[PDB]
Write a protein that binds this ligand. Sequence first.
Ligand SMILES: CCCCCCCCCCCCCCCC(=O)O
Length: 277
Amino acid sequence: MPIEIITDSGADLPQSYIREHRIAFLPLVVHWNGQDYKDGITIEPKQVYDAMRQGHTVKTAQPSPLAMKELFLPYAKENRPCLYIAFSSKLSGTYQTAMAVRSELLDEYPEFRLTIIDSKCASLGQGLAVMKAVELAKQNTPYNLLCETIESYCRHMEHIFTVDNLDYLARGGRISNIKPLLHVEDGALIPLEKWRGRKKVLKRMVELMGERGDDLQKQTIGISHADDEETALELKQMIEETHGCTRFFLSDIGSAIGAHAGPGTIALFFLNKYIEI
Ligand SMILES: CCCCCCCCCCCCCCCC(=O)O
C-alpha cells in the first residue's frame, strides 16, 4: 500500500488541500466559555479573532488520545504505512501524546509502520513540509528515505513573524508603537527584535530572510496571515522585488495558532538550506 501522510491543524494547510491529497487530519482543539471546537473543522479564524476582539480569551487544547487513536486505527488494521508530521513538540504536548498513542497501537498492531516526526515547525513552515511529503509519497519514494528526508527538511525551515501585540502570545504561554519581530528556534518561539511601526518590521522580515535564506529564488516561499491577506500580498511583492522569488504559498493562520498569535500576525517560511524536493 502507498504511504499515507498525516498531519494536524498546526500545519495551516487549507482543507481544500487536505482533502484533495487525502491527508489524514488531526484537528487541534479551540475552546472558551464552555464550548470546544475543532481547528479547521467547526471553527474558522474570524470566529476566533472576533471573539478575542470582544474581550474573550480563546484557549486551545491537544486533541484527545482517543481522537488520535481513532485516526490511526484504520491504517493499523489495513496495515498501511504512515507518516504523521506533527506540530512542534515545544508548542504543544500533542506530539508526545501521539507517541504514547503510537506505543499503545504498536502493542496491539505490531508491524504497523507509523512514523511520527516532531516537526519543530508551526503554521506553513509545517505545512510546506507536509506538502513535500505528499510529493515524495506520490513518487513512491522508499518509506525510510522519505521519512528521513522530511525530517531533514523540517530541520532547515525558518519561521520569521510579527504579531500586533505580544500579550496574546504571552497569555498563551508559548513565550515568557513598537511591533515585535520573532522567529522559531529549534521549535520554540523566541522574541527577536523591536521596531517602530509595521512598515519597518515587514522590511526587516524580508531582510532577515535574505540573510538566512538559501537559494531563495528556487524555493516556494510560504506566507501566512491572520485574516490580513492585503499585507501578505504586500509582503509577497517586497519579496519578489528584493529576492526575485517567483514561487509562493499564502494561507490564513489556523484558529488554534491564531488564538495565540492574535490579529495582525504575518509570517514567512523558507529553508536556510535548499533541500531540492
Ligand atoms: C504565522 C504563524 C507563525 C508561527 C507562529 C507560532 C505561534 C505560536 C502558536 C502556538 C499555538 C499553540 C497551539 C497549542 C495547541 C495545544 O493546546 O496543545
